[PDB]
Amino acid sequence: HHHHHHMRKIYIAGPAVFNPDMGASYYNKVRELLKKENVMPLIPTDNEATEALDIRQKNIQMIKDCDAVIADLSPFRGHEPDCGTAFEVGCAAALNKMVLTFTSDRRNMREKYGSGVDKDNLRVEGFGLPFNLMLYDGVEVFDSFESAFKYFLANFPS
Amino acid sequence: HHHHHHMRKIYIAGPAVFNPDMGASYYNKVRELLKKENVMPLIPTDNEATEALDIRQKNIQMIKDCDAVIADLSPFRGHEPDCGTAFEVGCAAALNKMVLTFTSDRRNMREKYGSGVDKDNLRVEGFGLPFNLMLYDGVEVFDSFESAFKYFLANFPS
Numbered sequence A, B: 001h002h003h004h005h006h007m008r009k010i011y012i013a014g015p016a017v018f019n020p021d022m023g024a025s026y027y028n029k030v031r032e033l034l035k036k037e038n039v040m041p042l043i044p045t046d047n048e049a050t051e052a053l054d055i056r057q058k059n060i061q062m063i064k065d066c067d068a069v070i071a072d073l074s075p076f077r078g079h080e081p082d083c084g085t086a087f088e089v090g091c092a093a094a095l096n097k098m099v100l101t102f103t104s105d106r107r108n109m110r111e112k113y114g115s116g117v118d119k120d121n122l123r124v125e126g127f128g129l130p131f132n133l134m135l136y137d138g139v140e141v142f143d144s145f146e147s148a149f150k151y152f153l154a155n156f157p158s
């Protein structure tokens, strides 16, 4: 009786932080969706420090503390995902965390660039993936945050 | 007598792999520099598998096996570093590896974009750093592979 109850936590990785509203609209939608399932979002800007190294450490700790990462690997400033998000995906991988990724553009990299090379003749990966192969771990690449969250609910029960 | 001798190993993270020569010129220069100090480069394309997941796994293993990562965080396809490299930096951070980074462009992000926002009104970080703050861990951002390697030699002796 009155056993400790673990509340599931998801690290919310993605470039929404760079939206004009600092991600407020995205994070509010995430908060509402997760609240209904008693899941807590771990949001990069929560209780935000002022020093870069402190912000980084807190975010790494959030990844250490999470049950899963849902990472927004949508195009950011071109066809490539956000590198901060990519760092967080790598951190989670090394820690053997469940990593779920989504993108607004699921086309293969060569489809996105329209060629096997970019405008500067740099090679575009040819592995039938939407982004750098390091970011793919065998789990399906989802279309949306919501679809990734549905996978979480099915595969990480309370 | 005849004790085991550890050979130092550095994971060579960076978008050189996307050069037309698949990084041959960069990697050859790296090989020559490291050879002189009895350091072994762990190069992403070494004994390259055909399947994305196998390539990724081998690269993660190289990071697990390394003494340090030297990561090329130079602009790739714009002002942002390569996301594969960023993933690898994240992996290394979580594994408490020595991470050394360099870039061909050390200007602050806001200097690079010329503004506190990009062309789409997305926020450019203002922390006096050349790239996404997750990629900075307190170690100096170097100007070149060689300068990062000199730091390695000074701070990771045999």
Ligand SMILES: CCc1ccccc1CO
Pocket (backbone or CB within 6 Å): A017, A044, A045, A055, A059, A084, B125, B132, B133, B134
């Ligand atoms: C200010 C940008 C920010 C905020 C929270 C966590 C990470 C970052 C940059 O990666």
Ligand SMILES: CCc1ccccc1CO
Pocket (backbone or CB within 6 Å): A125, A132, A133, A134, B017, B044, B045, B055, B059, B084
């Ligand atoms: C084929 C490109 C490549 C090769 C080795 C390791 C990683 C990658 C892409 O991230």
